[PDB]
Write an enzyme that holds these catalytic residues in place. Sequence first.
Site, short mmCIF file in Angstrom:
data_model
loop_
_atom_site.label_atom_id
_atom_site.label_comp_id
_atom_site.label_asym_id
_atom_site.label_seq_id
_atom_site.Cartn_x
_atom_site.Cartn_y
_atom_site.Cartn_z
N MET A 41 0.84 -1.19 0.00
CA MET A 41 0.00 0.00 0.00
C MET A 41 0.88 1.24 0.00
O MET A 41 1.78 1.37 0.83
CB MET A 41 -0.93 0.02 1.22
CG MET A 41 -1.96 -1.10 1.24
SD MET A 41 -3.05 -0.96 2.67
CE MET A 41 -4.08 -2.40 2.47
N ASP A 42 0.61 2.16 -0.93
CA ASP A 42 1.31 3.43 -0.95
C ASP A 42 0.68 4.37 0.08
O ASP A 42 -0.08 3.95 0.95
CB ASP A 42 1.32 4.02 -2.37
CG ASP A 42 -0.06 4.15 -2.97
OD1 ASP A 42 -1.06 3.91 -2.26
OD2 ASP A 42 -0.16 4.49 -4.16
N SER A 43 1.02 5.66 0.00
CA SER A 43 0.53 6.62 0.98
C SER A 43 -1.00 6.66 1.00
O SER A 43 -1.62 6.61 2.07
CB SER A 43 1.09 8.01 0.69
OG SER A 43 2.50 8.04 0.86
N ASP A 45 -3.28 4.47 -0.41
CA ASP A 45 -3.94 3.19 -0.15
C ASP A 45 -3.98 2.89 1.34
O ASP A 45 -4.98 2.37 1.85
CB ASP A 45 -3.24 2.06 -0.90
CG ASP A 45 -3.44 2.14 -2.39
OD1 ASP A 45 -4.22 3.00 -2.85
OD2 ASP A 45 -2.81 1.34 -3.12
N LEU A 46 -2.90 3.19 2.05
CA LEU A 46 -2.84 2.92 3.48
C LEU A 46 -3.92 3.69 4.23
O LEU A 46 -4.59 3.14 5.12
CB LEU A 46 -1.46 3.27 4.03
CG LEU A 46 -1.31 3.22 5.55
CD1 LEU A 46 -1.41 1.79 6.04
CD2 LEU A 46 -0.01 3.86 5.99
#
Lengths: 95, 55, 50, 175, 80, 353, 368, 48, 115, 69
Positions: A41-43, A45-46
């Site tokens: 997960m990128d920024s 998505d998290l």
Amino acid sequence: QSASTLTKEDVLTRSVSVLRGFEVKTKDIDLQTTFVQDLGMDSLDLNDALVALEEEFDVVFDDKTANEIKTVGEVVDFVLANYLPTEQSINHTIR
Amino acid sequence: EESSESALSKATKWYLLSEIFRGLYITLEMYFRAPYTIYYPFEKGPVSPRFRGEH
Amino acid sequence: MIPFEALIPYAIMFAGFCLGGGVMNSAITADITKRARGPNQEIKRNVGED
Amino acid sequence: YSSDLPTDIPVLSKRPHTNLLDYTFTTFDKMKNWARKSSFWPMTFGLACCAVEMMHVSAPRYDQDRLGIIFRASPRQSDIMIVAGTVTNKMAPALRQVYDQMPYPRWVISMGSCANGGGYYHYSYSVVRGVDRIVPVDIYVPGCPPTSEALMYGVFQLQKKMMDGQTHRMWYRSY
Amino acid sequence: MDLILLMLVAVGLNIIDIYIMIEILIMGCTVNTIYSASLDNDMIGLIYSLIQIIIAGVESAIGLSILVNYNRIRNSEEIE
Amino acid sequence: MLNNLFDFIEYIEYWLIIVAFVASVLIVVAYLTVAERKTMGYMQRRLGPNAVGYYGVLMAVADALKLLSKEIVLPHNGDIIYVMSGPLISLFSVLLSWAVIPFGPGLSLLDSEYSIIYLLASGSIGVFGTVIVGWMSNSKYTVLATVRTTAQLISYELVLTTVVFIIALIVSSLNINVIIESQYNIWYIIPFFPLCLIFFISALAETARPPFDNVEAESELVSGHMTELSASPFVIFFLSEYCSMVLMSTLTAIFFFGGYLPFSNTIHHLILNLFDQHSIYYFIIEGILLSGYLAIKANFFMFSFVWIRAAAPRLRYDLLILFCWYVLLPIVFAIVVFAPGILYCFDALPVII
Amino acid sequence: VSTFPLKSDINITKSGKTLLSVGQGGRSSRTGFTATVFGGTGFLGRVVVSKLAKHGTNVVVPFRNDRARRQLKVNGDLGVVNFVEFDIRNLKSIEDSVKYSDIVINLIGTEHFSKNFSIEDVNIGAAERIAKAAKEAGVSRLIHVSSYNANPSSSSDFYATKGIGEQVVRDNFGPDATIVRPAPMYFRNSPFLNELLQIKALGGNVIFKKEVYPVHALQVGEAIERIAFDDATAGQTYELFGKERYSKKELREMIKHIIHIGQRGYYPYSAGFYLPAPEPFLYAFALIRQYISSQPRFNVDQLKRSHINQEIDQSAKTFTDLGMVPDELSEYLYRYVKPHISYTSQTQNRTVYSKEDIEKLRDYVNTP
Amino acid sequence: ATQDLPPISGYAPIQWKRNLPSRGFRPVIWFLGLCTATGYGFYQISLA
Amino acid sequence: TNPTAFAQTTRYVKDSTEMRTLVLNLYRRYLRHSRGFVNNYNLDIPASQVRTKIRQEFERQRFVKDLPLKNVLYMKAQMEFQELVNFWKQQCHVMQYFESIKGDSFVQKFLKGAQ
Amino acid sequence: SSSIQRTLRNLWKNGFKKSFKQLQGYNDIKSGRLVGTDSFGNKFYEVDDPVEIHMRTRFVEYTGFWRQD
Ligand SMILES: NC(=O)C1=CN([C@@H]2O[C@H](COP(=O)(O)OP(=O)(O)OC[C@H]3O[C@@H](n4cnc5c(N)ncnc54)[C@H](OP(=O)(O)O)[C@@H]3O)[C@@H](O)[C@H]2O)C=CC1
Ligand SMILES: CCCCCCCCCCCC(=O)OC[C@H](COP(=O)(O)OCC[N+](C)(C)C)OC(=O)CCCCCCCCCCC
Ligand SMILES: CCCCCCCCCCCC(=O)OC[C@H](COP(=O)(O)OCC[N+](C)(C)C)OC(=O)CCCCCCCCCCC
Ligand SMILES: CCCCCCCCCCCC(=O)OC[C@H](COP(=O)(O)OCC[N+](C)(C)C)OC(=O)CCCCCCCCCCC
Ligand code: SF4
């Protein structure tokens, strides 16, 4: 009444299902499962996952904790320690 | 203690609504005066040669 | 300068009360007197000459 | 399934009275039209300097109340909407919502150059170029501002059009 | 229908609805007192009926104040 | 026909008496709306309605007919129960209060030894019907107005009830007709001039009339509880409010100005001596005369309702609560102890006769 | 909608006129066309007139109701919308409407009859008269909107007159007349959905069993715009219907849950949501209100049509012939029944039914 | 002659200071009349 | 005086790391209030679609490098948030916000006059 | 200007026919000296009555009986 009825196994189980509905690299999620590495997960998505895990458990992550969260187990720890049932009206309890 | 009116003087103006009844009387005077209303369109308000209207 | 136009609605309101009182006082009094004339309809309605 | 339609029957506004029911529904229309014209209740919607002249119509010199004209705060008690002032883009949705809440029958009067077409602020980034882009308008009163007599004349034109209504004879002769 | 406690379904699900039931139940006692006193032509029963009405209104106020303060306790933060 | 036609009128006579009673009250209420604007207009140096009907006599008819020809606003056709139940309770309450008003001796639809209680009890129901409009409503101005109606009711209800009880105590009766006939030698305006002011002040608060118009404050709550009401539900509430103004004006004339008793006993006898008492025309004139005395006194207080509206500004309702509980209640409860003490001292305790 | 409804800035009508367009397509722009929309004050005319006037096409709207036409003027710029007081029993007024128009759209049609007009007068007599008046005035394009089940040999007096009206339009105006056959149209204040949204629907056990292929009213209004501005659509018959088939019983039950009337187990049955009645009573009540009620109620012919289902004419053209994809009622059903949801009003949380949720609800409705 | 000017003597002075002189009897008299009316009223009530 | 609800004091951030955290915190607030936006503004779409729309706007400014532009973008994003939550925007404006959205060829534009 | 003496005085001058027309459009019974008549047919009057207020010394009689423009 105004006390939590949460167990570590239920919170983990509900966390896994909510994380399964996303686009994660692996469906094998446990406490040690990291968000960046294992699930990928990128920024953005998290934080979509955190809010999704907020709605499931009716809890709100603080800003300090949310920015520093790494693993799935940290979320389960947070929910167990901070969850409170919402206050009901003056009639729900005594009647 | 430093007032000019007695306790009964101030209570009589208070209980009997002295200034309220005066305001009613002033209003009742207007009931007997000529009203200002003109009957448009049978009568028209004053106009001046400088008036700006239709081109 | 008494404004007579303003006093017109009060005249009709005055006549409003008088309509109720004039009817009620006469209609009720007449009916009580009519029914006190006798035990049947031919005496209540008709008026004897004597 | 054959049909045969007449060709020379006049329109409703020019159709004379032929039978008894033509007079009966005309009488029904006239009484309702007479009441609505007589009870002319505009909605308090003064936006700008055009509202000052609308306040002077209620002033003792002109005294709109003598004609049965009473300003109502709530749209539910109003049947006339007088747009007296500039309509801005920030206000247009509120103006439309307020108009939509008036029970029928409802009429709209557009007063002043701002409401008619924008006026002095026609080329402004934040002005609607005419209130008739948002709501239907029945009469347009010109002036900047229109005088109190100019507004009363506009009301008298609307009352004249209201007295020509044929709603119940429309049901009889057009439906 | 009374012995299966059908009245327990007719009472609403708020604390105030319990208050209304109590008022209605007491009002049944007063109607029974008025009915008996009128048949007997007895003014002592009507004096009793008047006392019941005044007293029943007193407890209605005392109970309301308790419920009023109970609701205030919940809305206690009052940061405004 | 003939006989059947004649005694069918006897079978319907009392219904026409009620229809005439209803018609008479509605005429006063209809033309009070016209008279208020005419009275305010000339006090404000305008004319008031003079263009609807000859000299403005059809203005009330036009307002009713126009409002009765308007669409009713409600979420659904089956939601009539919401915004119609309230207006009907308010209207039925004030109309039923007129059943005990005597236009002459014995000329009241209801006569009983508890007419005073019926009068107070009937009007209290109208207060309930007003608050029903804010029935979990989403209109915040209707909701804000419902709170103020309760606050005003608490203010005036104790004072208005206690004042009428003092008048009933002086005659030792709760029959309205007995109270009127008890004022033959003295009008209660002279012994109870303070109570007449308090009764009128309470009447202004009960009817939500200015300076106590905190419920329908246009500058504060657009229209109060009426902001969502249109067409028929608005007429009924408006009709009932002006019916209450006529009722409280007539009660001011009954409790303190002798009701239907003549202003001059000499003139009253002079006028009635022209008509033979053996003819029905005497009783028509007497009915007109007695109601005229009541009409004149009630017209003055209906004028006074309009008069105070055109002279005084509005008072906040939280100040009204303090005024009624700290000023009016202590004074009225003093007189409820004062009056029996005076009468006992001079051996003049009242009895019914 | 779009930003400019034309494929070019020059359009030569089949009557010989050359019409140029100016502007980028806003309110101040023009297309050069003059159109006459008969029945513009109706449910579909307000959609059609709005789409024509927004792009600058001058619209002549003949009206019989003076109040209903006022809202149409807001659609276009100054001079764009024009009104002609008219009657189908008046010939001079009908010619005046078409005297300058290059396009004539006929939306006049009723499912009822009254003291003044029968179904034959309106669906045939008016359509024939308007088509002939259009031809004598040199109108290049005529568009006539019939119903979905138009058939000259139908048992229904509405379906029959609609079918015959299709024939008479071509016999007067000529082979180039275009015919549109919309399905039941759903929109705000839609006559199709209004009867389903009504609570006290009497005899729904008979009336609501008809199956149809409902179509979005905005697309029908959009399709007519395409047809008028594309001369390749002359002489063609279009069946405008949705892809999915629904029975009014399904939609009636699907709507009930969206309105949440089923929140109480007793209230729908107590409030009159279900009003079963024998068909002879439905016939007598419909027949009686035809000569007692002054407002058009459920009449006798609509009772007959309740049995006849919608049949798609396979020889006609569809939305795909116009290069458009039909909308799905599942994606629009919520927003058009949204005004009727009882409590809503951000009480606790709105139940916004997405397109996926509507189809899930349909299965639950069909589950016994 | 060609312009609006004040007269040679000027205009007469106008009234602009507050003019609301008090009117009515002293409060003592009003209180006495109230007591006088109350006393006479109860005398008639006592007689009746 | 007191500030309105959900108001933040304006501050010029001079640290890109601190700016990044402030952006991520605000992005979470948009997601949490997404169900509130559907309720207040009576939208015809699920809250899931609203959250998707929010992410797109944050993804547009993903690769803005200059710090002064970040502060102005952040400040304007905070003002919009305070506007939506407090229900200051009228419902028509929010409905049109979701109304937003293949280009024609050369000849296609040539025929209709192009742009 | 609002008294019944002025109205009865003007009612006697105009006559029933002219005053009833004023009772239908004018809302006020008024009298004056005929000053002229325009090309449309309106009749224009001026009032010498000392009790008439400032802006009411000139008035028009319209040709119609039910509507005045
Ligand atoms: N679900 C649907 O709506 C369907 C529609 N259709 C057809 O589409 C067309 C559009 O109808 P729609 O807009 O939906 O609803 P409407 O019922 O409002 O259509 C009727 C229109 O034609 C006018 N009209 C009817 N009779 C007359 C008459 N004697 N004289 C003058 N005008 C008349 C009406 O004028 P006015 O407004 O003044 O009353 C109205 O504008 C209709 O012809 C209909 O038969 C067919 C299948 C489905
Ligand atoms: C008769 C029954 C009706 C009226 C009953 C009540 C009237 C007022 C009583 C209290 C007066 C008071 O308290 O008097 C106090 C004051 C004045 O006193 P001051 O300020 O010291 O004067 C200063 C010094 N001087 C005495 C030299 C002037 O008087 C008033 O303002 C009297 C106003 C009355 C005029 C209006 C009369 C009509 C009113 C409407 C009636 C329907
Ligand atoms: C039953 C329920 C309660 C009663 C309700 C009463 C409401 C009042 C009625 C409305 C008034 C109205 O309509 O009169 C106003 C109208 C409006 O005329 P206009 O539109 O300007 O055109 C008319 C002028 N022309 C045609 C020249 C342009 O005058 C009329 O035409 C009146 C003419 C007919 C008079 C017939 C009188 C017959 C006797 C009736 C009495 C016994
Ligand atoms: C024993 C004999 C009893 C007398 C009977 C009458 C009692 C009246 C009591 C009044 C007291 C008062 O006006 O009270 C004032 C109170 C609160 O005022 P506050 O905040 O205390 O300021 C005042 C205190 N000062 C001055 C000492 C600092 O509110 C009000 O303004 C009420 C206004 C009521 C007006 C209603 C209009 C009625 C018109 C009637 C026409 C017929
Ligand atoms: S039109 Fe003129 S007077 Fe009217 S609001 Fe605009 S600027 Fe003011």
